[PDB]
């Protein structure tokens, strides 16, 4: 490790800071002598963060869905870093939206998580990417696992994918102006993301009003019965959010940042290998678990 | 080949017949015997499409980004078809958008393509599936090279990349219904979809309002330099387009449908093999090219 110099003199702004992966690394890299920029959703979460913090850290309130807000902040950014720039940008902030069976869903449900994980991503980079071109900084963006291989219905699946192949034009566009972009690939970690009673809070809500048809395939109590997977293997969450934030640490210090970090062990050494394999191999993986639904011929 | 029996009592729905590899598969299918639903955004291209073609052929007027035009077309296909349901679906709608590098775009810039090449495909999807289901039928989404590796800055790139997502996140739902999803992942193609000069006048509209810095870094007559490279390598786009709808007719066929198709001979010898490649190897290959910018230190 030849690390960079000057970490004190250094600005990273991170998105999403309330709470999981963006909370713990603001407080790391304040404790690391970066001065941090800690963007977070809420008044509370930017409270907390800031009594737990040094003076050279600083909070903003950011919602990375209003544009308004993200040039705002982008403005208050430029104006405090001055000719220094912006080293790091750290796009963190995300949220699994609802997940459920593909044929449950309406179009209007795939919305939410592509506007904050995807367009909400672009807007806060495409906005502070002067300052990072300034800095000649990095540009590190938290995709999933989810953007490599597909876990389930919904929206998430393809706001991740979309991520993947965002980032990747990125980094050829910004590789003449000398900035790095990292992407980080996290396995399953328990945060406040993804929480099995939440998302069979949200597939009750749908069931009430699906069609007749869906709900004698799949049956009554197929919701239950899903709960009872979700939980059933729900022992292989990591719970070290530092392997994530350690991915981070590099990609903001180290003089050769990857351009990929996969963190969790089933990531590295499973899931992502599996990505690369055809459907033929992913799918007898993946459905060995699926419930099995009461009526599939009544259609 | 043992392909599927009773072609003649099969109904197939193609999006974006007007032109491309849409109108070539719905005359192609039409010759076959397939009854075509073939669904164009004008009145112009269904007019010539429906004087090319037989009475089992009918169009239908659908712009995939207005839900209650899709919602309406999917009312009809359902009536129509009655209890045969509807054999295949062809998401093949789609266009490019503005190409640019990263830095000239707002986020603006990126809604277009992902609105018609997933929002849009995913709800044409979520339409039809009932009927697909009891058809116990078949799925075929476009995607792109581009959806496996990134060609370039704008919205096309996570567009694809996200329908990859969308495509296997269905595919592992629809297993329990017997129905297929494929997958088509075209090489370049002389159709509508990119002209080096439509593509060079939406960069001219967008350079006209970029900050005076991006025009000092890139410099003047970057775009006329970006011109002379499109050209200067345009030698190596297929012009046989019953290559990919050779794919769709597979898909649609065969008793034994693959998940993947791809089309093109760059395409499959060299291009997917190389989105499996870590950034290392892609940027090297994929800058070579990349036209020099005047003053990159300009930041
Ligand atoms: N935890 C996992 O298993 C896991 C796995 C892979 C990737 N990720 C990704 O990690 C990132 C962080 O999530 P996490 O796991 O720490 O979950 P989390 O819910 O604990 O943290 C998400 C953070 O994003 C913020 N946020 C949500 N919506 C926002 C919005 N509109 N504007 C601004 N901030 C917003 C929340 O306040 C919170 O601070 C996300 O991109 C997530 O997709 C998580
Ligand atoms: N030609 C290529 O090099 C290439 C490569 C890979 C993938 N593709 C994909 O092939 C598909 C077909 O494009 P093409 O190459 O034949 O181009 P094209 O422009 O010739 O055809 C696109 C078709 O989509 C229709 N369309 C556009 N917007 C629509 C909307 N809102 N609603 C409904 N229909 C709409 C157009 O009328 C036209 O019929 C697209 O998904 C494209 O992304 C093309």
């Given at each position: 490790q030849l690390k960079i110099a000057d970490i004190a003199d250094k600005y990273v702004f991170i998105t999403?800071?309330?709470?999981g992966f963006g909370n713990l690394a603001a407080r790391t890299f304040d404790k690391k002598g970066f001065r941090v920029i800690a963007a977070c959703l809420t008044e509370s979460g930017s409270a907390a963060l800031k009594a737990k913090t040094s003076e050279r850290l600083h909070t903003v309130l950011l919602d990375v869905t209003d544009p308004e807000n993200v040039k705002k902040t982008a403005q208050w950014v430029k104006s405090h870093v001055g000719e220094k720039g912006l080293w790091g940008l750290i796009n963190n902030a995300g949220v699994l939206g609802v997940l459920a069976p593909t044929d449950w869903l309406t179009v209007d449900d795939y919305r939410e998580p592509i506007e904050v994980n995807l367009f909400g991503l672009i807007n806060v980079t495409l906005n502070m990417l002067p300052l990072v071109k300034k800095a000649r900084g990095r540009v590190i963006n938290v995709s999933s696992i989810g953007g490599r291989l597909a876990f389930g219905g919904g929206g998430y699946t393809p706001s991740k994918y979309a991520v993947e192949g965002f980032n990747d034009s990125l980094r050829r566009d910004m590789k003449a102006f000398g900035v790095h972009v990292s992407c980080i690939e996290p396995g399953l970690?328990?945060?406040?993301?993804?929480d099995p009673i939440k998302t069979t809070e949200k597939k009750l809500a749908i069931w009430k009003h699906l069609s007749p048809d869906i709900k004698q395939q799949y049956g009554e109590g197929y919701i239950e019965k899903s709960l009872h997977r979700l939980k059933?293997?729900?022992?292989?969450?990591?719970?070290?959010?530092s392997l994530v934030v350690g991915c981070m640490d590099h990609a903001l210090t180290s003089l050769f940042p990857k351009t990929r970090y996969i963190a969790g062990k089933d990531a590295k050494t499973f899931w992502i290998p599996l990505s690369?394999?055809?459907?033929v191999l992913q799918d007898f993986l993946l459905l060995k678990q699926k419930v099995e639904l009461a009526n599939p011929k009544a259609v």
């Open positions: 999403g800071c309330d709470t970690f328990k945060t406040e993301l993804a059933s293997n729900t022992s292989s969450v990591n719970l070290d959010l690369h394999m055809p459907a």
